[PDB]
Every structure is written in structure tokens, then in C-alpha cells.
Enzyme design. Sequence first.
Site, mmCIF file in Angstrom:
data_model
loop_
_atom_site.group_PDB
_atom_site.id
_atom_site.type_symbol
_atom_site.label_atom_id
_atom_site.label_comp_id
_atom_site.label_asym_id
_atom_site.label_seq_id
_atom_site.Cartn_x
_atom_site.Cartn_y
_atom_site.Cartn_z
ATOM 1 N N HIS A 1 0.905 -1.069 -0.013
ATOM 2 C CA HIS A 1 -0.014 -0.040 -0.142
ATOM 3 C C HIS A 1 1.112 1.327 -0.083
ATOM 4 C CE1 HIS A 1 0.395 -1.440 4.069
ATOM 5 N NE2 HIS A 1 0.105 -0.049 4.566
ATOM 6 N N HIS B 1 1.797 3.596 2.339
ATOM 7 C CA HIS B 1 2.475 3.843 3.651
ATOM 8 C C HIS B 1 4.068 3.665 3.505
ATOM 9 C CE1 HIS B 1 -1.194 3.340 6.551
ATOM 10 N NE2 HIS B 1 -1.314 4.657 5.967
ATOM 11 N N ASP C 1 6.332 2.252 5.179
ATOM 12 C CA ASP C 1 6.859 0.907 5.410
ATOM 13 C C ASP C 1 6.583 -0.082 4.071
ATOM 14 O OD1 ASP C 1 4.176 1.244 6.694
ATOM 15 O OD2 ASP C 1 4.392 -0.912 7.285
ATOM 16 N N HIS D 1 -6.497 -2.897 6.346
ATOM 17 C CA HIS D 1 -5.525 -1.966 7.037
ATOM 18 C C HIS D 1 -5.431 -0.562 6.365
ATOM 19 C CE1 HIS D 1 -1.793 -0.138 8.462
ATOM 20 N NE2 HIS D 1 -1.571 0.016 7.182
ATOM 21 N N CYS E 1 0.367 -5.743 5.680
ATOM 22 C CA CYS E 1 -0.114 -5.059 6.877
ATOM 23 C C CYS E 1 -1.725 -5.431 7.243
ATOM 24 C CB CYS E 1 0.204 -3.610 6.861
ATOM 25 S SG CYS E 1 1.758 -3.162 6.808
ATOM 26 N N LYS F 1 -2.007 -9.386 10.808
ATOM 27 C CA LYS F 1 -1.075 -9.249 12.116
ATOM 28 C C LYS F 1 -0.499 -10.625 12.576
ATOM 29 C CE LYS F 1 -3.019 -5.363 13.121
ATOM 30 N NZ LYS F 1 -2.109 -4.143 13.616
ATOM 31 N N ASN G 1 -2.701 1.180 13.861
ATOM 32 C CA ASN G 1 -3.062 2.375 13.039
ATOM 33 C C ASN G 1 -4.097 2.356 12.029
ATOM 34 O OD1 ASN G 1 -3.030 4.699 11.485
ATOM 35 N ND2 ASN G 1 -1.145 4.116 9.983
ATOM 36 N N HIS H 1 3.966 -6.872 9.585
ATOM 37 C CA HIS H 1 4.872 -6.501 10.996
ATOM 38 C C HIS H 1 4.927 -7.619 11.675
ATOM 39 C CE1 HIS H 1 4.847 -2.020 9.932
ATOM 40 N NE2 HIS H 1 3.520 -2.330 9.828
HETATM 41 NA NA NA Z 1 6.701 -3.324 4.567
HETATM 42 ZN ZN ZN Z 2 0.312 0.869 6.572
HETATM 43 ZN ZN ZN Z 3 2.417 -1.635 8.280
#
Ligand code: NA
Ligand code: ZN
Ligand code: ZN
Length: 228
Positions: free
Chosen positions: A78, A80, A82, A141, A160, A163, A172, A202
Amino acid sequence: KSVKISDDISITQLSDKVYTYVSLAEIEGMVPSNGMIVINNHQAALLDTPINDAQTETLVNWVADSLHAKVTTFIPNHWHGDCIGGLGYLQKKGVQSYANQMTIDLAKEKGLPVPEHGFTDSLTVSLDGMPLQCYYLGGGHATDNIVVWLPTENILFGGCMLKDNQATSIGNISDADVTAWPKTLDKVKAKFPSARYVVPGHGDYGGTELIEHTKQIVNQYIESTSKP
Ligand code: NA
Ligand SMILES: [Zn+2]
Ligand SMILES: [Zn+2]
């Protein structure tokens, strides 16, 4: 087992052609982020970048130095940091990129590095013969989150929207579609029953149990903010 390298990055091999990495980065918290390295004929696909150009560079030089593979391809989960934090550097390197058109649109509007080729439903990228099957199955997410499946390897990088098994919180949700999330997870579970390894955005990777686990967290969140 993982092999630690500079810039707080470690890498674990899941198959002869697939590796997953964890890059720790400092937030607002030294937070870990995951991604994958897929290798075929000395060419590599990077699935998500670490949060910045510097860590991305270290990772890409390592793949060339130790895995003897040139990163030629990139796909982010996506928009973001990370996922595309080091896209600037990948573009200077001349790396080719593919992403959900939604990701491209959000990246553009936000003045962020912009992936080149955009797909809206599914896309199969051939890394010199080895398939990387990308799918947009709904918001979670992030509204634009996708998953990448490696059919020849039975490995899913859910990103993301998934989990790890030790996670207890939703995290978030600033960019999330909370009510779509459980539906997206049902679709993911139904589509990849054969997954050997399932990697989250993560935390530690596991198997398909992460999908159901994540669905419980999300549904628990929805239940807990419904009540009077
Ligand atoms: Na990543
Ligand atoms: Zn994200
Ligand atoms: Zn993330």
C-alpha cells in the site's frame, strides 16, 4: 534462521528463491517492518521497501553482494512508508514497479514516489519466468492494500492487513476501511488455502492461522466501539 546485516535489517530464507526481511526503524519507538525478496535467474523482486532510501540501498546492495541477484522489480503493499519509503532510491536505480492503481493515485496526490504500472483487480508479473500474483481483494488496514501470492512456492505476503500471532491490537486505522477488513480477510482465506508461509506487514510470519487471528482482532475492535 535470520542473518543480520547493517541498518538494523535481518533476513530469513523461506525457500531457495524466497526470503523475508525485517527492517527496524525509529518512529515518533523502534518499529520493525517486513518485506520479501524473490529471486529467479539472478534477478530479484522486492515486495515492499524499508522506510527510507538508506535502508533500502543497504538491502538492495546485500541482495546483489550475497544473493548475487539484481533487483529489477518492485511491488508495494500500500502507500504507507513501510511499503514505499525507499521507492525514490529504487527509481534512481531504474527498478520497474507495479502497484494497485489506488496506491498510485494516493501516492501522486500525497507527493510521494509513484509506482509506474497500475492494476485494478489482479496482475501476474513474470520475474523472468517466475510468477508473482498480485491481488486487490478489498480495503483493510489501508483502502488500497493488496496481497502478493507466489504460486510456485505456496508463500503469501499478506502485508499489513495481516497481524502476527502475538498481536492483540488493531493498530493504526487512520487509513483503514475497518468494516471492509474482515470481508477482505475472508476472501484472502478462501483464496489461498494452500499457503505454507503467510507473512504479515509487521511481526513474525506463520501460516494461514494469522488470517483468522487477524479477523478476531478486527472483529473485536468493531464489537468494542459499537456498544453504548
Ligand atoms: Na513493509
Ligand atoms: Zn500501512
Ligand atoms: Zn504497516
